[PDB]
Amino acid sequence: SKVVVPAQGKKITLQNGKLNVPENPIIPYIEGDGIGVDVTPAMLKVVDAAVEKAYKGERKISWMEIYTGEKSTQVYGQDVWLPAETLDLIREYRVAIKGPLTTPVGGGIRSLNVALRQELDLYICLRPVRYYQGTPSPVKHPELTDMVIFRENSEDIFAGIEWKADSADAEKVIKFLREEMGVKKIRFPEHCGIGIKPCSEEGTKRLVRAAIEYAIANDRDSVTLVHKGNIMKFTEGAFKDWGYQLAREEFGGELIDGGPWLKVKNPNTGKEIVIKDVIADAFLQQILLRPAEYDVIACMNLNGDYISDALAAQVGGIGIAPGANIGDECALFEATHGTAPKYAGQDKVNPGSIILSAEMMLRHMGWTEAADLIVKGMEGAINAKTVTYDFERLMDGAKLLKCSEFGDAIIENM
């Protein structure tokens, strides 16, 4: 039923991992709710301008609006938050980009952000954090952070397997645990909520295969597995040991003096790449105290939420962190931040997050030149101290811009 597909426009296809991208591709976008209505028109305007500039008119994206969240009940009936159509269309057109979504409390509907991250088996959440020169940071040295986070998106506590305290189904499970498994370490059995965290060999090896093939393709110095595997041994600890098994078995890892750390040679370059582990709690400290030691980070779903959002804040970026969820059959690039409805409609928020998830969308397609021009413009707009609420509420001798006008500032700087 009612979504409008373009006339001038052809669709992206696959041919084993490598995808065939037309001169005139159809790219789906979901507006987002709240500030989605402000930031998405600006993201469309600078991507279009960056491809006019780089390819001098040969290439053009035909943009196709698809629906999720609030904006979808308005179009299809107040109870459908996620239309099956949207799922069949990202799988078919292969790359899409979304603005913020937040899910309603009241219907026992789970994070829409996360129902898509998994109904489409988009198992890699990739969030790069670098310092853009000139951003207000709270830390003294934010320039040392050039990290790339690879977060497992189909597992962990984040999958949604849990039952309400005192419910039918939850008591059955505690009877099963005390009686048939011989478990005495639940301090209080009565009026207790239980949740399940799973971690599989297959599930973690495809995230670490993905993170190490990225270290190779991009001349990167280290791959740090972070985990709290000293207390959660068979989930998170199984993840560091399966992650090191895979760098031995598929990549020819060798030891560094007496372990535990391994060496991988970069086939294309000859630099030695390091495969190390740091307990997740000690890692939260090591990112503030010693950030140049780490580059690519691989980890399970919950820790990656945490490290991204902690690193993003440290470099000045809550409002500008990019994000992609990449799978085997398709990818979805998104704004990382909330919906923020207090400020929606009145054009003020920073659109950098969704614009930089678009630089990412563009180099995924292999339109590196348009991607590199969007990061030239963002680097300039910011250096020109010509900026938006969030960066001016914190900076001296800067000029204040609306969301519209900041997009224009990025174009002006290409």
Add this chain to the structure above:
Amino acid sequence: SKVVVPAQGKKITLQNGKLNVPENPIIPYIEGDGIGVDVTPAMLKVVDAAVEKAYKGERKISWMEIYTGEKSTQVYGQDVWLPAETLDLIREYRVAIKGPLTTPVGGGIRSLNVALRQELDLYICLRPVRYYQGTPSPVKHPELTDMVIFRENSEDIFAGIEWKADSADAEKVIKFLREEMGVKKIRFPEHCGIGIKPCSEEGTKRLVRAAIEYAIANDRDSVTLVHKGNIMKFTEGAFKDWGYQLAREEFGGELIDGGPWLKVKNPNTGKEIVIKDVIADAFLQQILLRPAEYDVIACMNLNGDYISDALAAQVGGIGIAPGANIGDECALFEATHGTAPKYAGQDKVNPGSIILSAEMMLRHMGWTEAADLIVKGMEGAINAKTVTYDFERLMDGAKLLKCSEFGDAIIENM
């Protein structure tokens, strides 16, 4: 069998929450492994000196060494890491203090740190983080952090309920989940590890009763419940709702304009105390960006590990964060940091962590005057720029001290 109890010395007793503390109490201490051998002699020397100074000889602690960890196999037989005796002695003498412990990989023994935190039902892990003036920090403004963390220590994923991938007992559990509970959200059932996170009404209400009675006793401004309850609804989300139920039902909380936040009046002072919630991932950002908004933090076991260790690093404190595990029948104060055996025996590490878990031990006993003198000396030693490896490897125009000599510096400053 062989632990030596002192002749001059009487023991602490209880009388409903309030404990009767002698002039000459027996306090157990566990040396710790690794740097435990360096830092514990210095902690004994400054506590003894602070009670000579404050009470001009009337009071004296009779110190009694008890055994856990490495140092216990040396004394009782290479397989006993935790002698039941140690458990019966902290319950009997009621307060003890320990240096670092790390558990052996190889016997399927769980964190000793954590077997004591729970076989003694020490459900409050309390870790205060303030900035000591003069400490090297990585953040621009570390002085804004004056926070007190209340971490639930008997539950969460941290309890140890999990089974190895492909094991007998783990397959039984996945058959039970797929077949009898109708669960289809385990992406890969085969070669999967499962873990259990529980959260009870009783378990969380005694941690939030404890954290709010601390806000009252200490003129404190906010109580922030942190949680990832937007994705883990029936564990972590049950925790924010049970925590707000308890501030209504036992403390007379009222609403702040339209929710969700509540107000509690301080009976002894009349200041209004705030009861707020922040999603745990957004909180990791808010501690760097906006730290003056938060004061007392309450949260489940895993997030509290994380927030303590993240806050401690931000204020310059990895090596000096204090810690107490407090229960209904007893309390154990500890060093927060690792064993660090590369540097053990050669007197160089910073003993501030275990010395400040001792200031805490002392005001728990109601010897506030000795406690206040230890924080005067630490404030001075540090201001005098007369300090140890970790603070000199990072500071200009400072004098370097051994662990021994830094204790002496704290005494000199009282």
